[PDB]
Amino acid sequence: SKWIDISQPLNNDIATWPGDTPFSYEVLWSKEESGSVNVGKLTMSIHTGTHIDAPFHFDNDGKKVLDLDIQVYVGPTRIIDVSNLESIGKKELEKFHLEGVERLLLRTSSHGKANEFPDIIPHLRADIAPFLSEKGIRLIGVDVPSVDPLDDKELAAHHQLFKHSIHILENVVLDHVADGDYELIALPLALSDADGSPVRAVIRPI
Amino acid sequence: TSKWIDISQPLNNDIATWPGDTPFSYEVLWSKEESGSVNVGKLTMSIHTGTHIDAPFHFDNDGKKVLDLDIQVYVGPTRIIDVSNLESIGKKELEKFHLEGVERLLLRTSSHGKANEFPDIIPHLRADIAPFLSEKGIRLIGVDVPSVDPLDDKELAAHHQLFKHSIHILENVVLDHVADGDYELIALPLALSDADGSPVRAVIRPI
Ligand SMILES: CC(=O)c1ccccc1N
Ligand SMILES: [Mg+2]
Ligand SMILES: [Zn+2]
Ligand SMILES: [Zn+2]
Ligand SMILES: [Zn+2]
Ligand SMILES: [Zn+2]
């Protein structure tokens, strides 16, 4: 059974957060110039395309990306539809079967345009954390750039999720995949000092 | 149990790069004190830093870019073998291993293993290795050094021949803390539309 790509393409047309570094890939040394190889240079914000946050992003004493447990980003995941909801909390999630789930991906179907930064997204309410924590959920993923509203500076959801040991994955592309169980892979790069990492997220149907 | 094991080089500002190539840089542009909410970071690097894959574009102007690459190649059963104390590695040195049904192969040269220094000399792969591995069904080869060709070679025989036989390339895996044998491997490139390679997080789990 094939792996399916649920990552946003990364190129110089991708959207970023306002005030983040624009994405740049450029060929530093071409093959004409080097005599052998095309060699690339990559400049970006960590939070561009499909990626994971580390606690250090929103907490000065938080863990950096390399201090994170890799076991969390690989394994069984459940995918659910939570479209047409302004916000998502305990109430909206109690209707789903979630027993023994370790990793949960939410399809909001809210945006899905990797080249535009949205004006508004559905966010997670802070009661979601104790609820998911209690069920054993270590990772939550959403198909939008954030778990908190776009203009919120408190980042309640970020803080609460990581206080309950739930890790965060943003900007997965879920419109071409059905609800259900899969294996997930979405590993961060081994960055010693970083606040997050882009990843290649992929899934395979159980 | 059966935990995944990291076989990637740590990426930080002391990592080595190819001579004259973009040095690696992770830096906080705007801190949480300054912004009132978030540490805002910037990542600058060469593609060919730390553990990473090559795409055919890197050495062929008409080669595929990273996103054109088949992801199924970079996930699945792999075999690890020890080829230390060899100046070069070809058919001859691999014929002593039983390699039937293998799709992905990792070679421990134990030649260098210092992520913070760029080596003066490495063991390279000879070009006869490609038909040999190709015939057996091998789609990916990995080495614990920065290149499959010698550090100063401009022809890049090994690169060209590997990809001409549909064998993909993974460089700078860290193998000294892992035993030979069978594993599941994961080493996926980032979804880079226009790039000549991608860094990866390579990990393995014992079968
Ligand atoms: C930097 C890089 O990728 C490179 C440059 C010269 C020769 C071989 C290489 N892999
Ligand atoms: Mg052309
Ligand atoms: Zn983020
Ligand atoms: Zn976030
Ligand atoms: Zn390379
Ligand atoms: Zn190479």
Numbering used by the authors:
A (entry chain B): 4 to 209
B (entry chain A): 3 to 209
Please give sentences taken from the publication describing this entry.
This enzyme catalyses the conversion of N-formyl-L-kynurenine (NFK) into formate and L-kynurenine. The KynB subunit, approximate mass 23 kDa, comprises just over 200 residues with about 50% in 12 β-strands and 15% in four α-helices.
Formate did not elicit any spectroscopic change but L-kynurenine and 2-aminoacetophenone gave comparable Kd values of approximately 60 and 50 μM, respectively. However, the characterization of a BaKynB–2-aminoacetophenone complex structure at 2.25 Å resolution provides a suitable template to inform on aspects of molecular recognition in the active site. Key to ligand, and by implication substrate, binding is the interaction with Trp20. An intramolecular hydrogen bond between the amine and carbonyl groups of 2-aminoacetophenone appeared to be significant. Therefore, such an intramolecular hydrogen bond probably defines or constrains the substrate conformation, and orients the scissile bond such that the formyl moiety would be directed over between His60 and Ser149.
